[PDB]
Design a protein around this ligand. Structure first.
Ligand SMILES: O[C@@H](CN1CCOCC1)Cn1nccc1-c1ccc(OC(F)F)c(OC2CCCC2)c1
Ligand SMILES: O[C@H](CN1CCOCC1)Cn1ccc(-c2ccc(OC(F)F)c(OC3CCCC3)c2)n1
Ligand SMILES: [Mg+2]
Ligand SMILES: [Mg+2]
Ligand SMILES: [Mg+2]
Ligand SMILES: [Mg+2]
Ligand SMILES: [Mg+2]
Ligand SMILES: [Zn+2]
Ligand SMILES: [Zn+2]
Lengths: 329, 324
């Protein structure tokens, strides 16, 4: 029913699929480590996407399970739980009142699909590490958005596996449009594009047009894709805006992943990357810095775009900043 | 022998590269690159073992396809030699470092390696594995770079083995920036920016250009190699005509694949409904002349003879087209 199994209670947790702060770790446990499959299936059913795009349910489940299997179980942060989280967070953002009836079903499908594949086959090390170690991936992609190009290629390639083509009943034009949107969205998740992306989002907020009900008026592909890019980027950077217990766990996981990268750097006699040295870390201080320099500036701007829809998310972010500030040794 | 006599023209625009291809046993890229590396003393400067250089060049040349009419090793050798001439333009004297020179020449050599003889748009439209790998974005150019660099890993092929770490990093960045700029979809943006650079250009007393940051330097190198890539119509008519025969052969083969697949045949790819003369005049009027006149402005008067030949060849190609 939920598309995996077994001994439920899962249904009661999934009632929060439309809420910020769904307990995605609980969902992962209750689903036998299939949070991405369970959450995607739930969202596709809720949004009636199977009917709209004539997606056979068995094809959807087969693709989701295959996709989920290509997130690495031994990567602490960039795994299937993170993918599930970003999907579900995008799903909530898409339903914000300021965006009512703004996006087509194909644009919604693109944002959700992009979210699901956006980190697939992540090795648990950064683009810069891949470049510095002369990896085959960095060679393939000429040092540019190395991971993000790879996530796209894998996510699309998996559609070709037996009974995995969830887009089989889209028209040729729809497939082309969705492909372009998905590429545009996932490439925008490269953190090196953050400053430019934000600057442009600020420009959009300055010139925003809304109806009397505060619904955004987007004029063209440029407007629509920019909103979707920033939406998924916000979802990717949403951990510090979540209920504190979720945020605390995400922080533990990213630090575990960073520290493992630092261990690889130390073993190779390389300079250890910022925040990756387990011997000299300031986890709490670094979270406060992350919020002050990256996450708050982004979310404050999103909050402006959709005002006042994101006020509670912003309030939670500010409370969570204080938690980490208060726990600096 | 005769080859040595022909290679005496290596510093001149209009080198007979087809003759060099014949005389060298179809090794124009290897012989021209070797000649240029000796001429510019690059082996000494960068401590490149001659055996390593030849090994790499032969394997690189092997990775251009013999069965592709235009985008083959002869084209690569032509772009290398043309870049070599442009680098020596008086307006640019003593402007570029040896590493920058090495980057531009290397970029030229690898810039179309493993080209399949079909366009990016064809690869995108046919859902090719290459377009899947590269997310429909500069598909060929990303691939040319990956292959060109990958070949440095073959036995005794690392020509950059004695560069410092920082030199290797810098060369890699520049080569990527240059080859990506050969994607024709970037042409109008490159040109718009080149025009603005020309408008605000700075020169020394001796009239050499002042390029005081990476952005300006790489911009000039990008446009230089792009001009070399688009230099066929600026060459002596006998050479230009041969290049035109080759590109049309390649285009028509793509059009044949499109027709077989039931696709709309791309512009200039239908052997049954194409005018070679009309298409060349269009290529010159809308792409090649606007680019070369801007290059000519940048380095005035260095490129006046090149621009003259281009204008002559345009007048020649339009001569048999009836007009009011
Ligand atoms: O495909 C070309 C772009 N179009 C756009 C609009 O004007 C017509 C050309 C550029 N390109 N890209 C790869 C190879 C070449 C290219 C290189 C030498 C060419 O001609 C001659 F010099 F040999 C050449 O000729 C074109 C083909 C028919 C008309 C002129 C093309
Ligand atoms: O993985 C790349 C590559 N980086 C490049 C530079 O050095 C290390 C590797 C970046 N990245 C992707 C996702 C996150 C991230 C998600 C949640 C985070 O915190 C908490 F919300 F969970 C988080 O916190 C970090 C510690 C404070 C600043 C970053 C980071 N980072
Ligand atoms: Mg990512
Ligand atoms: Mg069907
Ligand atoms: Mg607008
Ligand atoms: Mg090319
Ligand atoms: Mg003109
Ligand atoms: Zn992510
Ligand atoms: Zn070329």
């Amino acid at each position: 029913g939920v598309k995996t199994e077994q001994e439920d209670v899962l249904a009661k947790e999934l009632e929060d699929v439309n809420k910020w702060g769904l307990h995605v770790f609980r969902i992962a446990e209750l689903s036998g480590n299939r949070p991405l499959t369970v959450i995607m299936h739930t969202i596709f059913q809720e949004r009636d996407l199977l009917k709209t795009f004539k997606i056979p349910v068995d094809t959807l489940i087969t693709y989701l399970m295959t996709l989920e299997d290509h997130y690495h179980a031994d990567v602490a942060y960039h795994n299937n739980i993170h993918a599930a989280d970003v999907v579900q967070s995008t799903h909530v953002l898409l339903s914000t009142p300021a965006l009512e009836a703004v996006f087509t079903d194909l644009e919604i499908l693109a944002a959700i699909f992009a979210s699901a594949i956006h980190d697939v086959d992540h090795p648990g090390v950064s683009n810069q590490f891949l470049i510095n170690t002369n990896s085959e991936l960095a060679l393939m992609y000429n040092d540019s958005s190395v991971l993000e190009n790879h996530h796209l290629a894998v996510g699309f390639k998996l559609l070709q596996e037996e009974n995995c083509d969830i887009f089989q009943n889209l028209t040729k034009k729809q497939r082309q449009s969705l492909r372009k949107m998905v590429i545009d969205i996932v490439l925008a998740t490269d953190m090196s594009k953050h400053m430019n992306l934000l600057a442009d989002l600020k420009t959009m907020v300055e010139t925003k047009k809304v109806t009397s009900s505060g619904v955004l008026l987007l004029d063209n592909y440029s407007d629509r894709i920019q909103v979707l890019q920033n939406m998924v980027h916000c979802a990717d950077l949403s951990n510090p805006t979540k209920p504190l217990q979720l945020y605390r766990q995400w922080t533990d996981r990213i630090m575990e992943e960073f520290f493992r990268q630092g261990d690889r750097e130390r073993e190779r006699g390389m300079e250890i990357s910022p925040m990756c040295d387990k011997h000299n870390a300031s986890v709490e201080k670094s979270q406060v810095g992350f919020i002050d320099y990256i996450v708050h500036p982004l979310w404050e701007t999103w909050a402006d775009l959709v005002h006042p829809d994101a006020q509670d998310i912003l309030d939670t972010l500010e409370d969570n900043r204080e938690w980490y500030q208060s726990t600096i040794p």
